[PDB]
Amino acid sequence: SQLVLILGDQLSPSIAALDGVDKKQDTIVLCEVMAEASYVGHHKKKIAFWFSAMRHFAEELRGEGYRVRYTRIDDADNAGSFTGEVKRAIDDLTPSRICVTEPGEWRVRSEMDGFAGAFGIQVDIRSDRRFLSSHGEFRNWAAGRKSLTMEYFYREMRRKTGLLMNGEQPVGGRWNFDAENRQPARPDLLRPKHPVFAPDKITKEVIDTVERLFPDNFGKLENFGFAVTRTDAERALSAFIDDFLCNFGATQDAMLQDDPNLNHSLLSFYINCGLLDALDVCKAAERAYHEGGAPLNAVEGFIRQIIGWREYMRGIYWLAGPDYVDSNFFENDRSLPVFYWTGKTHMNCMAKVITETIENAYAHHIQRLMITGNFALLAGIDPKAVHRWYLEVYADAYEWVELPNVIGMSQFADGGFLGTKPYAASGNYINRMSDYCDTCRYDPKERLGDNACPFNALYWDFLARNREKLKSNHRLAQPYATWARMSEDVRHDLRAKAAAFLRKLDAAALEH
Ligand SMILES: Cc1cc2nc3c(=O)[nH]c(=O)nc-3n(C[C@H](O)[C@H](O)[C@H](O)COP(=O)(O)OP(=O)(O)OC[C@H]3O[C@@H](n4cnc5c(N)ncnc54)[C@H](O)[C@@H]3O)c2cc1C
Ligand code: SF4
């Protein structure tokens, strides 16, 4: 008989490990196991989402006729590790083999590589076919290139899937419509509200348990609205296609104080644990285009984020190896400011985004990149500490997708390995793309003096102190030219102002 192990982010009835299961003799094993349980950064809503999502999946599998062994977070016998739980399961079920789908984390994959020797039983680790490229295919793709860029890989995924393909030509005569998706947005108070799902009996029980076992963890549990069933996740997909997809590209980079969601889909939490399938989501958007529900620049832009970025990050993560997390191109050692955990900062943009993170366990892409990520980059934060924050505070966070977004795209801590450019930006960018500055005590137009937006001096200081490593970068040529034409006294005053702000950070850090 088989022991079929299914992990917390593999909540799909077509997951590879269920291939060829004998429903009457095999047993599916689901275990609420948290290796980092004592890390208080993990958002309470994320933990509640994990476990509620997993308990509904166990019930769904039983309704399908499977035999399911379930261990809760609060079970007295919970061994606290996948190995310990698999050992407890072997004792009950006396299987002749273990089937499991390859995990999405370096550390968990290695642990499972040890099952065969630790238990003396056959172990079959199956390739996770929810991704379009195997590890080997992606490695061979990268070997033929020398400089990796997402856009090359995306073109290959467009051909492999057929999405928005007319034979071997892209639908509409163009591969990518990003150029049309970059304007700022004014508020639109008729934009519909996003779907929320009231907690059912199982979710309320998880919510109470999380409050009881992680009382001092980051984040609020109030107004938990995540879908936790396959059917409700699809209701969230439907809501996005009917209400927001047609305007998705229009506002893709915009930020608004009173609208935390704009036209984003808010489906990442569901795709990443298996309640939605990535290719099914793209096909839904593609259908919307042919039925006239959305324009091409919006549909292609949406699909590019999933079979382009999301599939690319997965390949980068496995190709870069376990020690990618140690990338530190600029040699930063500064710790993460405590206001990333509290929101208690006078920078209005940072305050609002961190607050939304506290309350919702979600922020949309341009806030992760250009607000909290940009600040950490400019401030010279240790990239590993930035990594820990993003992995812990967002409900769609898993290492394989978060790490290449933090190490590569946001912090440039790999020196540009995945092909992006440095996203350093001054307060002038935030003032154009958002209305955060309108109610901020600081002034985005000032770089010196007590009123000045902190991003302005920090932007120049970042460029100045990293000049040897960045001067050849084409996209920074104009900024470095402007810098070299300032007087020595102006350059000196900008760096002294930046030092004074970094000093405020260091003095607070050397409290705790
Ligand atoms: C510092 C940083 C950390 C990030 N951490 C994560 C993370 O932990 N988990 C995560 O899923 N995404 C992460 N991203 C990518 C992106 O910000 C989120 O996927 C997005 O905000 C999810 O919101 P949404 O579902 O409304 O996406 P939408 O704006 O509706 O985008 C549609 C879908 O495309 C995918 N997608 C879009 N952008 C990216 C991207 N850059 N990389 C991978 N997939 C993408 C997601 O599946 C998303 O659901 C990160 C980006 C940055 C800059
Ligand atoms: S002024 Fe500087 S700090 Fe205040 S909001 Fe605009 S960008 Fe953020």
Side-chain angles (χ1 to χ4, degrees), residues 110-156:
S110 300
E111 181 173 7
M112 314 220 300
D113 287 326
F115 284 172
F119 307 133
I121 176 186
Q122 175 165 339
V123 183
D124 172 32
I125 308 184
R126 308 185 166 178
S127 176
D128 186 348
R129 46 169 196 261
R130 302 180 285 174
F131 293 96
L132 302 170
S133 183
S134 70
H135 303 321
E137 300 172 321
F138 192 88
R139 182 180 297 273
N140 275 349
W141 173 79
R145 328 275 317 123
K146 198 69 167 179
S147 290
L148 308 184
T149 63
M150 185 280 281
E151 282 74 22
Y152 272 79
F153 179 70
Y154 169 61
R155 271 193 304 280
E156 297 301 295

Side-chain angles (χ1 to χ4, degrees), residues 240 248 264-268 271-272 302 305-306 309-310 313 362-365 368-369 390 396-398 401-402 405-406 409-410:
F240 165 72
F248 175 89
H264 296 277
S265 75
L266 275 70
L267 306 174
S268 57
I271 308 181
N272 289 349
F302 178 71
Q305 314 311 307
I306 294 168
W309 278 118
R310 177 182 194 267
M313 303 315 212
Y362 170 83
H364 54 93
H365 179 70
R368 306 198 205 189
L369 179 73
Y390 281 92
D396 58 15
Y398 304 81
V401 61
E402 163 268 330
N405 270 296
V406 176
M409 196 189 282
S410 175

Side-chain angles (χ1 to χ4, degrees), residues 15 17-18 23 33 38 50 59 104 153 156 162-163 183 193 211 214 288 294 356 358 382 397 467 475 500 507:
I15 202 71
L18 287 165
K23 297 200 166 151
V33 181
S38 65
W50 286 343
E59 291 286 297
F153 179 70
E156 297 301 295
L163 288 162
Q183 289 313 309
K193 211 101 178 171
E211 184 46 56
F214 314 84
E356 292 172 2
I358 292 175
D382 169 16
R467 185 174 184 278
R475 311 113 197 261

